Design a protein around this nucleic acid. Sequence first.
RNA 1: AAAGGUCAUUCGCAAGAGUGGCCUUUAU
RNA 2: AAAGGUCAUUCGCAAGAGUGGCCUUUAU
Lengths: 218, 218
Amino acid sequence: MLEQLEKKLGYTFKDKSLLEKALTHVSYSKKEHYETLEFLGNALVNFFIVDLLVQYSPNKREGFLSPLKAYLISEEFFNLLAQKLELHKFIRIKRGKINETIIGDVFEALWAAVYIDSGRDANFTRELFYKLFKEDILSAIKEGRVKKDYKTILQEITQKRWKERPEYRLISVEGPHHKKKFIVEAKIKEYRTLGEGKSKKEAEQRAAEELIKLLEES
Amino acid sequence: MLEQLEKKLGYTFKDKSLLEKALTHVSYSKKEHYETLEFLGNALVNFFIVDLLVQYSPNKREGFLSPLKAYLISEEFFNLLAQKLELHKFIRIKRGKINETIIGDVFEALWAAVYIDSGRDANFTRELFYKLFKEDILSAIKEGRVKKDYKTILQEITQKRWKERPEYRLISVEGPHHKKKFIVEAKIKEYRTLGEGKSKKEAEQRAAEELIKLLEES
RNA sequence: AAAGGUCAUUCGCAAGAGUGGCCUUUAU
RNA sequence: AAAGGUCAUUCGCAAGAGUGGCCUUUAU
Ligand SMILES: [Mg+2]
Ligand SMILES: [Mg+2]
């Protein structure tokens, strides 16, 4: 079973218990799970990615590098990189389903495990990591594009035009506690739009997206 | 002069312009300054710190490791570790004076410089880093303690007791725009307290501290 | 950690930038 | 990234825990 993953990883563990720990969620084993390895892998993987980002990024301005780095270490991207490994069929869990949060954390812990198993050889681990994902990362860096959210876009418009910030007002809150529906109002000067979502922010983001369009019509 | 810093670092650079760039603020050189190196150094050092932290921490709980890690990569701590280096006498800058934010950023950039100049040798750089600071880090980790802020403590108190959170509002704002004084009000149930500070958060932190007392005195 | 506004101050013919304080938005 | 409250759900005699939703605090 593990031999398969080791083959996809291109690395054979000296300590197989270290590899399964990385693959084990707290629900399956409360004494030997990946939580602490995840803490380490996050730092480790963060380093490998930044190093690539600094070398190959077309734009080295902080406002570009920071948002892009955040995406390159996001759960989303990690799940994207993990596909190749098929972690979903090596992961051990009980009270839960192997969602994208679990996958991303196991991905991080998995890299910490390799690092440790190899006698804490960062250089070796970085290369193994690059041999597997360098191209995929450089690819995403080349097609890198920072995109602002509506709430941010809106206040930059209003701070430019009237040097003021839009007022977000909570209008309604319906539904059961585990699935609420929020209706918020965005207002600037005398303009006001509405927005709804499953969270205040989502609702405000919708509201803001409207106030922008509203303002375009002038 | 650079030779003096290399002796403190315990490493001789092949590319001196690299060491120089790490020491150079944008005010002194618009084209070759430490901004990008700082980006990378932060990631590299974060990894050095975390690795030590997962191996030597008294407590491995997320709620302990996280707050503690935050302090271990904070500007405050880096200035502490950087003292020994006397970076203040090596940093190049025009517009301003070498403050703790500068020192902290140059500390990070410097390690990025060492990393790159050594041909991206992570193991080497890590050991050089430890040779200089492992002792100080282990010591801080041994004294490691999570310090909660008043606002956090207040809502945990009010949420345990009443399942509700305190509320803040600004009472008044005094002084010039570049030096304001805020007076804020903190409340829970029928209890209200005031606090003042150079910012809303400082004011609220102060107000929260007062309300905690008010609650103890019942 | 990044983004916008703003006050002060510094460099600058200008453009524009540095530094310090404040407000807000985003991400983790 | 961490902390606290809350709803749902799963495991549990209980304590307590896991997973999903929401609110909030902190840090960068
Ligand atoms: Mg994670
Ligand atoms: Mg920094």
